Design a protein around this ligand. Structure first.
Ligand SMILES: [Mg+2]
Ligand SMILES: [Mg+2]
Ligand SMILES: [Mg+2]
Ligand SMILES: [Mg+2]
Ligand SMILES: [Mg+2]
Ligand SMILES: [Mg+2]
Ligand SMILES: [Mg+2]
Ligand SMILES: [Mg+2]
Ligand SMILES: [Mg+2]
Ligand SMILES: [Mg+2]
Ligand SMILES: [Mg+2]
Ligand SMILES: [Mg+2]
Ligand SMILES: [Mg+2]
Ligand SMILES: [Mg+2]
Ligand SMILES: [Mg+2]
Ligand SMILES: [Mg+2]
Ligand SMILES: [Mg+2]
Ligand SMILES: [Mg+2]
Ligand SMILES: [Mg+2]
Ligand SMILES: [Mg+2]
Ligand SMILES: [Mg+2]
Ligand SMILES: [Mg+2]
Ligand SMILES: [Mg+2]
Ligand SMILES: [Mg+2]
Ligand SMILES: [Mg+2]
Ligand SMILES: [Mg+2]
Ligand SMILES: [Mg+2]
Ligand SMILES: [Mg+2]
Ligand SMILES: [Mg+2]
Ligand SMILES: [Mg+2]
Ligand SMILES: [Mg+2]
Ligand SMILES: [Mg+2]
Ligand SMILES: [Mg+2]
Ligand SMILES: [Mg+2]
Ligand SMILES: [Mg+2]
Ligand SMILES: [Mg+2]
Ligand SMILES: [Mg+2]
Ligand SMILES: [Mg+2]
Lengths: 114, 386, 197
RNA sequence: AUUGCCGCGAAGCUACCAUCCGCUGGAUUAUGGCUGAACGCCUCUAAGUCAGAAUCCAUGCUAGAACGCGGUGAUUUCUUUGCUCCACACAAUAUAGAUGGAUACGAAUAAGGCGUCCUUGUGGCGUCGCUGAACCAUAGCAGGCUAGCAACGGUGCACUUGGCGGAAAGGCCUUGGGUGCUUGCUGGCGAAUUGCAAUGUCAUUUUGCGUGGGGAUAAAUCAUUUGUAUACGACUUAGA
RNA sequence: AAGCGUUCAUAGCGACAUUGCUUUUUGAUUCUUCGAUGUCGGCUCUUCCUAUCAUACCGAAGCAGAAUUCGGUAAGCGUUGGAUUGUUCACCCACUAAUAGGGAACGUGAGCUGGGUUUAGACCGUCGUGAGACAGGUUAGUUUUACCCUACUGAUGAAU
RNA sequence: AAGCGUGUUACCUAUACUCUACCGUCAGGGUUGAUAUGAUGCCCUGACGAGUAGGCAGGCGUGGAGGUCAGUGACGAAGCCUAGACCGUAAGGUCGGGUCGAACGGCCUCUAGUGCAGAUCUUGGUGGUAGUAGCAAAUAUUCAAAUGAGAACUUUGAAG
RNA sequence: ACUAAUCGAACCAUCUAGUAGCUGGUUCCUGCCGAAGUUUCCCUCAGGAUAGCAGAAGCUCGUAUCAGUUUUAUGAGGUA
RNA sequence: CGUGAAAUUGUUGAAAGGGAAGGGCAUUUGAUCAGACAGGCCAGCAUCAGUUUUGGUGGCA
């Protein structure tokens, strides 16, 4: 989702040119990354080996509002909320079939070089 | 139907694309034809454009109604400290074009040209050319092997020079490295000339002289995104024009159903490589020569620096070239001065210029005094203490 | 019947050599063409120069950088005649054209390799004597190829190195053909003469 | 006092309202000619060929292919022992498509090539082509074990002596010894059952991982900073 | 090619006839578009054609010079400023080397303008009993949207 | 000549021609004292097969009804999902797996508010555009403290 | 002109599913057959009726009566 | 808050991608899958039958 975004030098570490700083999105992930990491101590996991194995964002139901347009018209003004979920994990540290020719060739090969 | 009124095109189609230059040092795209009888000299020089000033001289051209009379002309002064030769490149000929076959570097490189090879000089271990400098260590046999290849092959020989930007009032600290073709002599003399000038400077008086036409090769001054009125000189639309008047009204016919490459459109203005020819040298000045600005008619012991200094550059403490008129680029900008690609005999060339006066009044205003001693004599003693 | 067939471009007619090379690549034969500057075209030089000027003037009107490209080198003029005889927009035609190398002069490693000719493309076999013809070196230079004199200096350089290769090969062919000639009238020789060898 | 107004006003920007600068070589059209037949003469034309336009192509100028290319510098351990080279070991990875050998003068084609000779020529004589249907190579458990004879060769493998090759050299020619093999000739032993055929597997590319033998011991980006730059990216500078 | 051109058809012309080309005229057709392709002119800007006004090099003349006229290659490069008119067209003034002819959806209205035509207001003349008509005159009369794709102008950029 | 004219052969390839197979249609037939018990069946023989508008025929599917299968089912009915399988030229039918939780089929007949891609269709839901156009009139805000999880925007003070 | 963003006859409900020779749409498969844009009449010319073309149902019979063909014989025609 | 379709979307996995994508005939490759030993799968050879194609050769008018 990057049409007509601005360009920055800070995208170079990822090989892109369009990159932003979604302050409000980061706080919500930081809240869930803190909650999920907190779950790992209550489960007894090792925090030094934790990594984001699965993170998933879904469209929550839209919250409706209203905007008023020229010539007495009305258009929607909706929010696009999110469902976020994430998982953090500890690091982790046959038949052959031969024709009679192939059997004989293998047998002749084993009798030709010893 | 037809235009109903003929007019010339706006803008020059041969100077396309009007895009930013690839480098801030405009490259030399042609060197003069080599005649191998003359000694080995440089075909161009590097310089920093300091600024402009005013001269007075007597015109020497019969027929003109200002013959033998004092004319006033604008000159530009370029700061030219000597270039340090630090390399040589052999160019073999090929059915695809010139091709660098090998390069040989001087055993010692100054830090001002070592900086050219670094993006982050201050953090690095400064390892550039450290192992290469061990190719002269025992007896320099490996270096002699490479120079012999350039002698055998390499029908075209170019030398590598870098500026002594330390002796310049630029904040840059980093020298400009460039290839200059070597004309005069055969291939062996050219290689021998390059080898004997390693780590040694080359003065500008050996490559240039007074009264000769030279060309400037610099990137012009950048102006950013510009509209079509000041980028192409198109007519401004009438005052009544809705939705904008600094535009091109019709950007094409219905057919072909595309915008043409030849229609004036908004875009970058300036910072283009340009090569202007036929700039006569009016003075080849010297750095350790007080009375640079004096002439045979002035005798005022004054240098070329205007009073209070060159605005946005500084003082000229090195040698300099002083060519008639304007050259592309702005002050502080690396400019390449190249000898003429043809012999000019216009009678506007071939005529000896003797300066009668050089302006040193301040360019930071309406400077009304040439020297501090002149200002002191006219104005007298002031309240400001001695 | 060779893994790479190298044709010497000299003396050949450009279209008939292009017809053979197109069908040769499409059948899976790798082909290298050398000395493309001595290729030939039927018709006088001025007539073929006019035909290139008609080709030069056709370009995309709104952007010349995207239009028909007008390649100057005689190797690329010949390559321009191979396309149009090969379905170059398909992957099979792309794989065919990968089996082609065209060169000006004779570069290494092909300088010391065997070169062949195509007798259906040779001008001396094809053209009626008295009919005029164009050489691809003059045509390409007359429309802007910059490397005629460079190739000539390197071609004459190769011919000197190759003529003195053939000098010692004549001496060695002489010695070999002498001992073989003495080997005649022997017992083994007269038996092979009955068996045809 | 929405830049209160007036005069001056640097810097910056800017004006045919200021100044400077705007190249020379070839090939051609029309046309006029030369030589010269067709047509015993004539003729710019048929074969050849001269000059020649504001033409065309170059010189020059601009961009630089973001799937064209070259040269050059440095290339990270006291850093989950990282990187690179050489060799051999195991797996995978693919294949525009090996299945004896891409086997080298140059030019001409109403001419040549090879050989020989002479007085060294644009020379004499002989020979050849009329296709590569050639030439080289080519027999051995996919090519084994062994015995001699003849000869001092042929060919391979590393090692090696010297020279040459920069257009894309990266290959070519050598030198010397060592070690194989020899089908140049004469012998002896083995092969079987893949069952009457099943590509009946023999390659060269790329990548990991391993083992043992050498070698080296960087930068770039962000962030800060400049303004020769700039919508943003980008650019151009500075910082142990 | 009958004649004109002092004589002389063809320098330059050229009757009576006859062969074409073009699609910048106007006719003729009604094939596309009436769940709309914005409509005249001008302004602005680019490019193309050559049937060349000028400029380069030429050939010819009833080419002495000068100035002209005819013709060739040639569209490389130019072809203007104004009074009146909405005008396309026209006409004159003046400069100039010259003020050539055209095309591109009669180029170009999400580029402009809106003087004209071509809504609704109003006046005149003629016609009509009248309501009203007039390719007759006059005056006033909302000119909307690009942020998408391509194209173009500039500007980054993965992979080597 | 890979051009033009003319002549000779060879060769290439249509759903066309020949032969054969299979499907269907039509036509002519065979077949009852066991038709080796389905005569709207089984089988023999020949020909034929393009199709808008349109006509007819034989079938597939849906809601409900009479009959029947003493049909299936909480040991899982219906529904839904399923680059898993099988049958049919097809409309469609059947099976496996997952999800699910209460009804639902086969066959013979009856009946109809019985099959959707369109109607600027109706109602509802959802996209690309697009994190885009924009959130620019009304001169103007700044500093500290307090509160608070959080202060450009709240409170207080100061200043403008 | 204005008469509630409605004016050359407001708005609301009903008659009213007003009529439309006109525009759009008109939902499964397979099989067999298969057109017309022409005749006459019509306030008819974007429509109908009528004949023709097409399908279906067949019926009476069983190689007839025939025939988008020719030959032979015999007419007619007023175009090239 | 029964079931919980599609449009549309997120993650994961696989695959392909030089100015659209999609499709028809055929095959390669990858992945996946049904059935069958009391003949299932793929082939080779001989002698025939039907339809063709390409030669060699003999006797006649
Ligand atoms: Mg924007
Ligand atoms: Mg609003
Ligand atoms: Mg014009
Ligand atoms: Mg200047
Ligand atoms: Mg100044
Ligand atoms: Mg195409
Ligand atoms: Mg006020
Ligand atoms: Mg003569
Ligand atoms: Mg350039
Ligand atoms: Mg590049
Ligand atoms: Mg013309
Ligand atoms: Mg128009
Ligand atoms: Mg338009
Ligand atoms: Mg408009
Ligand atoms: Mg008006
Ligand atoms: Mg023919
Ligand atoms: Mg049918
Ligand atoms: Mg139908
Ligand atoms: Mg039912
Ligand atoms: Mg169930
Ligand atoms: Mg699905
Ligand atoms: Mg329940
Ligand atoms: Mg219904
Ligand atoms: Mg629907
Ligand atoms: Mg439908
Ligand atoms: Mg709709
Ligand atoms: Mg925005
Ligand atoms: Mg405000
Ligand atoms: Mg109704
Ligand atoms: Mg109604
Ligand atoms: Mg039919
Ligand atoms: Mg109709
Ligand atoms: Mg008659
Ligand atoms: Mg009649
Ligand atoms: Mg639910
Ligand atoms: Mg879905
Ligand atoms: Mg693309
Ligand atoms: Mg048979």
């Amino acid at each position: 989702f990057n049409s007509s975004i601005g360009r920055t030098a800070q995208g170079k570490e990822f090989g892109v040119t369009k990159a932003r700083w979604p302050a409000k999105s980061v706080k919500f992930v930081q809240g869930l990354l803190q909650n999920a990491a907190a779950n790992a101590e209550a489960k007894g996991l090792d925090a030094t080996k934790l990594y984001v194995s699965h993170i998933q964002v879904n469209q929550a139901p839209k919250q409706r509002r209203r905007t008023y347009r020229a010539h007495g018209r009305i258009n929607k003004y909706e929010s696009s909320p999110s469902h976020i979920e994430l998982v953090v994990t500890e690091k982790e540290e046959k038949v052959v079939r031969l024709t009679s020719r192939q059997r004989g060739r293998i047998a002749a090969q084993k009798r030709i070089a010893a | 139907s037809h235009r109903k009124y003929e007019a010339p095109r706006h803008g020059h189609l041969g100077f396309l694309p009007r895009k930013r230059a690839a480098s801030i040092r405009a490259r030399v795209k042609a060197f003069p034809k080599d005649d191998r009888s003359k000694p080995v000299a440089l075909t161009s020089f590097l310089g920093y454009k300091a600024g402009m000033t005013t001269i007075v001289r007597d015109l020497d051209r019969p027929g003109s109604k200002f013959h033998k009379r004092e004319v006033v002309e604008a000159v530009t002064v370029v700061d030219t400290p000597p270039v340090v030769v630090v390399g040589v490149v052999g160019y073999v000929e090929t059915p695809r074009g010139l091709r660098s076959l090998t390069t040989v570097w001087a055993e010692h490189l100054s830090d001002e040209v070592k900086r050219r090879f670094y993006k982050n000089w201050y953090k690095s271990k400064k390892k550039a050319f450290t192992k290469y400098s061990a190719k002269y260590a025992q007896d320099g046999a490996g270096i002699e092997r490479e120079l012999a290849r350039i002698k055998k092959y390499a029908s075209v020989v170019r030398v590598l020079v870098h500026t002594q930007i330390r002796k310049t009032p630029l904040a840059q600290k980093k020298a400009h490295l460039a290839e200059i073709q070597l004309n005069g002599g055969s291939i062996s003399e050219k290689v021998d000339w390059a080898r004997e000038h390693f780590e040694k400077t080359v003065a500008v008086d050996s490559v240039f002289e007074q009264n000769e036409m030279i060309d400037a090769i610099a990137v012009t001054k950048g102006h950013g995104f510009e509209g079509v009125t000041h980028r192409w000189g198109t007519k401004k639309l009438p005052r009544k024009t809705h939705r904008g008047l600094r535009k091109v009204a019709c950007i094409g016919a219905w057919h072909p159903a595309h915008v043409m490459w030849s229609v004036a459109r908004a875009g970058q203005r300036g910072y283009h490589s340009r090569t202007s020819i036929n700039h006569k040298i009016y003075r080849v000045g010297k750095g350790d020569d007080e009375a640079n600005g004096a002439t045979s008619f002035d005798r005022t012991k004054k240098t070329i620096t205007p009073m209070g200094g060159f605005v946005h550059y500084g003082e000229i403490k090195n040698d300099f070239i002083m060519v008639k008129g304007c050259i592309p680029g702005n002050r502080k900008r690396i400019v390449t001065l190249r000898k003429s690609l043809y012999t000019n005999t216009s009678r506007k060339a071939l005529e000896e210029v003797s300066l009668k006066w050089i302006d040193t009044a301040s360019k930071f205003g309406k400077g009304r005094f040439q020297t501090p001693a002149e200002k002191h004599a006219f104005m007298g003693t002031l309240k400001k203490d001695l | 019947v060779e893994p790479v067939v190298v044709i010497d471009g000299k003396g050949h007619l450009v279209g008939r050599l292009a017809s053979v090379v197109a069908k040769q690549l499409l059948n899976g034969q790798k082909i290298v063409v050398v000395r493309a500057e001595e290729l030939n075209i039927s018709g006088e030089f001025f007539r073929n120069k006019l035909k290139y000027h008609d080709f030069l003037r056709k370009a995309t009107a709104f952007n010349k950088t995207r239009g028909p490209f007008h390649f100057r080198a005689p190797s690329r003029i010949f390559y321009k005649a191979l396309r149009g005889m090969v379905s170059h927009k398909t992957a099979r035609g792309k794989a065919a054209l990968e089996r082609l190398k065209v060169f000006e002069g004779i570069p290494p490693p092909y300088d010391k390799k065997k070169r062949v000719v195509v007798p259906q493309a040779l001008r001396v076999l094809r053209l009626k004597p008295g009919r005029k013809y164009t050489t691809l070196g003059k045509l390409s230079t007359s429309v802007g190829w910059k490397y005629e004199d460079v190739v000539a200096k390197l071609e004459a350089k190769r011919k000197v190195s190759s003529a003195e290769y053939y000098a010692k090969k004549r001496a060695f062919t002489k010695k070999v053909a002498s001992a073989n000639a003495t080997a005649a009238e022997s017992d083994v020789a007269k038996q092979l003469a009955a068996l045809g060898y």
